[PDB]
């Protein structure tokens, strides 16, 4: 199971047990995010289909 802080390194490197030395780690997280929109000036006009 990939839950523990050390159980995630193996789960990321696809390996059962790891050697000694330095390793690179960066754990992302999938979620939902708000959205922003900035554009050059123009007026607003809408339609529905």
């Amino acid at each position: 199971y990939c839950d523990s802080p050390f159980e995630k390194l193996q789960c990321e490197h696809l390996q059962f047990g790891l050697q000694d030395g330095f390793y690179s780690a960066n754990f992302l997280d999938d979620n939902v995010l708000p959205e922003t929109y900035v554009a050059l000036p123009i007026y607003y006009q809408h339609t529905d289909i």
Binding site: L40, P41, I42, Q45
Partner: protein
Amino acid sequence: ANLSMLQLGVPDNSSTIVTGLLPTHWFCANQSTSVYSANGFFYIDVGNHRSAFALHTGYYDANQYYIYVTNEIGLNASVTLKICKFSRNTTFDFLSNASSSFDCIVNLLFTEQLGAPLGITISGETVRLHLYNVTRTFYVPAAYKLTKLSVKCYFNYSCVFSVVNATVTVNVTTHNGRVVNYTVCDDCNGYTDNIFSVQQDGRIPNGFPFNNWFLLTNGSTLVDGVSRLYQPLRLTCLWPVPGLKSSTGFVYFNATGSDVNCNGYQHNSVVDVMRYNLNFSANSLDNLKSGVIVFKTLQYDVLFYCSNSSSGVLDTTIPFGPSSQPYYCFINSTINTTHVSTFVGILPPTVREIVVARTGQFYINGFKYFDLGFIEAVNFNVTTASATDFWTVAFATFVDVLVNVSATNIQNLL
């Protein structure tokens, strides 16, 4: 200065409106030291003495370019211009302060006719050089910091010099190849940003802040970066303060009529565009002009107008400058008593420039809206109580250029 024609760019037997960095007032001083703030200088030397001028900032820097000009006594004008960095330096002195020159863009020696003034001016990162017969240009980086000016010359040795702050508008009259008069508008407000004088070969003068000169495009819009392009930026005439009225008529794509008063040089050819220019104020009380635009196609006329309602039947207006509510625009035409109308689009939030090509295309703010087949003349019917609607009306032709775009504007031109 009461100086040569080519140093100003005016033809024979005419009276133009020249704008830019120009010298106004001479000095006669003997204090031998005074630190000024300026952007250029003019001087005349005929005396037998050592005279030198120099431009510098307020503090030492080892990565800065310092201009330095030194005249030398002879039979002609011996001039030594040097533009480069300096090591441990000087307090001040004539005749080559310090030979610490190690990476110099320009290091020359001039021998020109005695009795002719010289000058150096700075605009952005561009350094000009007037020489009474030619106008050179160098591109030295980080040259907008050079604000101070350390002038050192004496009056008894036949030495008078002027100095420039900024952007003076003048009125120069020429006759038989010599300038006759030189007067400065205390009136004539706003002329410094919309009026210039066309140089030789139909070029556009350097150091002109492009106010409402947009980049024409068929697709997307450029935002930043240097981009080689192909734009109509070579004039054949210019009509300053036209004062178009409601009873003028048509204009026929050539400046050989009876009402055209070109400014500066004026060739004769056939043009491709007609760049208009709109004069508007910040307030929005009388920026709502009632009128139409009448084209002239080979078969039938086309009528263009805009309104603020979806059913464009009860109004006919064209706004200038900023607005507050959307406006819709239409097109009218007739084919055997059959009035046909269609919807074209919506004006941008601020209308400032209008361009009409000759092959049919019609641009607003540098964006195509529709396209006719072939246009012969344009009648800009606007009802107004005075002559204040437009700044200039310029004819142009397509020419390959190189543009430094910043924030959807034009900085330089080459």
